[model samples]
Target: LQSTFVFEEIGRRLKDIGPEVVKKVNAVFEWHITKGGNIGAKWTIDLKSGSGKVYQGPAKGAADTTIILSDEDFMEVVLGKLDPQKAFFSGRLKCRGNIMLSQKLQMILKDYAKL
Candidate 1:
């Protein structure tokens, strides 16, 4: 687990920095890695509420968008090593539900990348 990029750290940082970076959007996210890394992890961010949360398992309710990616790819993307658009185009990233909602992730990712 130590070698893996867990959601706990990211979640903590999200709550710390999300409010300032995230705004104009309120959405639930199901960040899914079907295998490897932190599979079944769940996340939700409400730019409107200026808060966000993450869990180790599945989300409690339906999500506005479910982002699908491999564990490695997810880590790279979040860490500013990978381009999200390239990942999507190359099939390393996929999304279910409201694809548009995923667009709001830019600021969130940007903020998270700083940490």
Candidate 2:
């Protein structure tokens, strides 16, 4: 998954939304790949630092977060069409990140999404 290029659909959506919003959420998650191409890793946004680190294991070391959703969900997120809060509330999305970091992302991206 690390080698996968930015999805075109995602790119189009980012363009429609504007670049700042794209910059925040785009790199918020570092998708970890398991043996079966399953998602197995995540990172936390340190907005002050403008940086994040992908966890190295299942344990929540630093920000050992993951979202093992279907590819469709991934597409929805990158396409900027998925409402993360709604997805989580409805069980359509899963997460294991620095919860605060994730929440901060939602707030930061709110205005960007409206673009």
Candidate 3:
């Protein structure tokens, strides 16, 4: 199955959680996902502003951090199907801009647990 629903669920769950996530992270993320060496989808996760934001589109402006990877791997990362740390070392994930903020992304993912 395509991973679009999973990404949408991520956005839905964010709305169900605390804005504290946004405040603490204070970052904007642009995710350009792929599918087997081709385009999958693009998403903008703006956690630096009002109640946080997640959209299936490019960042309205320069993003604070950008993650480029396969949608399959991303789905795995979100669903605990793959170890995120190892995914990076395995050379399937590409992170740019603020590295620290990328780590902070785990905050949201951790919150994404069991839902």
Between 1 and 3, whose lDDT is larger?
3
- After TM-score superposition, the amount by which residue 91's alpha carbon in candidate 3 deviates from its true location, in angstroms, is 1.2
Shift in Å, residue 63, candidate 1: 0.3
User: Residue 110 in candidate 1 has what lDDT?
Assistant: 57
RMSD of 2: 6.8
Quantify how close model 1 is to the true structure by its C-alpha RMSD in Å.
Answer: 3.4
Choose the strongest candidate by TM-score. 3
> How high is the CA lDDT of each candidate model?
0.65, 0.48, 0.80
- Maximum-lDDT candidate: 3
TM-scores for the candidates: 0.71, 0.45, 0.87
Candidate 1 C-alpha lDDT tens digits along 5-114:
55676567766676665464566777667556445444444343466666654556667788887766767876679988888889879888888777776755655575
Worst 10 residues of 3 by lDDT: 106-115
CA displacement after TM-score superposition, residue 67 of candidate 2 (Å): 3.3
Candidate 3: misplaced stretches above 4 Å? 112-115
Candidate 3 on 1-115: residue-level lDDT in tens?
3577876776887786638778788888998889777877888988887778888788988899988888778878877899877887888988889977888878656765845
